[PDB]
UniProtKB/TrEMBL annotation:
Catalytic activity, reaction form: Endohydrolysis of (1->4)-beta-D-xylosidic linkages in xylans
Lineage, broadest ranks: Bacteria, Bacillati, Bacillota, Bacilli, Bacillales
Protein's UniProt keywords contain Ligase: no
Organism: Bacillus sp. NG-27
Keyword NADP: no
Sequence positions that bind Mg(2+) 1: 18, 302, 305
InterPro entries cross-referenced by the UniProt entry: GH, GH10, GH10_AS, GH10_dom
Protein name: Beta-xylanase
Family under the similarity heading: Belongs to the glycosyl hydrolase 10 (cellulase F) family.
Residues given in the record as Mg(2+) 2 binding sites: 292, 351, 354
Documented EC number(s): 3.2.1.8
GH10 domain mapped to chain residues: 5-354
Xref: SMART domains: Glyco_10
Ranges in a coiled coil: none
Amino acid sequence: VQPFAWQVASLADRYEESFDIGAAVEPHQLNGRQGKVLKHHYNSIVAENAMKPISLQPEEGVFTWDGADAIVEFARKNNMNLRFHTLVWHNQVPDWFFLDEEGNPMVEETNEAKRQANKELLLERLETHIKTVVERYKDDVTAWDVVNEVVDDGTPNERGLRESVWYQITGDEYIRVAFETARKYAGEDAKLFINDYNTEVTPKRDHLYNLVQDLLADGVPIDGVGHQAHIQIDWPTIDEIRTSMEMFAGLGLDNQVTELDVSLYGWPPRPAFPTYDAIPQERFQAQADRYNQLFELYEELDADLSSVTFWGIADNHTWLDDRAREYNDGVGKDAPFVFDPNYRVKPAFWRIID
Ligand SMILES: [Mg+2]
Ligand code: NA
């Protein structure tokens, strides 16, 4: 039986010369056993859901700040840094954004002059949203996910841009405007990130690289790349992760690991173990080895890596469970962290604290 997280060495203290150690949180997790773990180990947090666009402006002019504010207050109370996730995404984003003045979806418009008017209207809505949120949180936020997941996994166009509703209506302009507007209101010292998953694998990595270089060439203010790092035990390789970070560092950009979890399964995540107890020890040991290697790499690259955030706290709450259940007939349990569901340490904890 392993000791509780609050009886072992602080991970934030361990990594204080190298990078922040962060966790994704929900407002209901800032008390009790999760609050205890968070205060002991982490010096950074991010909102899992409460700061996404639909969570902040669910209808036009109506802002819902309470969940977000609760997360900011916790960060402030405990001297934590704060990532803002996220100003722009194609999911968890309110429908009203993309309706024209008559109330119909902008993608349905065919008349060229009305499409141009719709584009202008959407970019204006984007600016007001960004302005309002940034004005509220600029003094608390230490890194912004300005845009999230705007690069595609395939090659639908030559630039590899995701053809979401944002792209369909504005092309790449929404990305430009998001960074320009964030810089404008948050000030020159705000750290502006483009965040994405599979930043380690081609062709996506190269599309992202090319995007960043294009935008930099046009003077668009991008300070860093967010590597979601939703990874597996054997995939991606240590070298693929290294090469990605080194590429972006080479452009003068900061790297952050933003949503790290180490799944016990492949993609798709099957076969999955039906419960936490059914998970065999080898999986935790294999995961410990993986975590060791990751964090040695992270330390090696610490001149170009400022923060490492896990997409959760302990194994009792992870979006990876939803995924497991989805490909295993409604039953499955993943275990991605260094703390187990009872907040006791796992083998991976020892292997990254040493
Ligand atoms: Mg180690
Ligand atoms: Na660093």
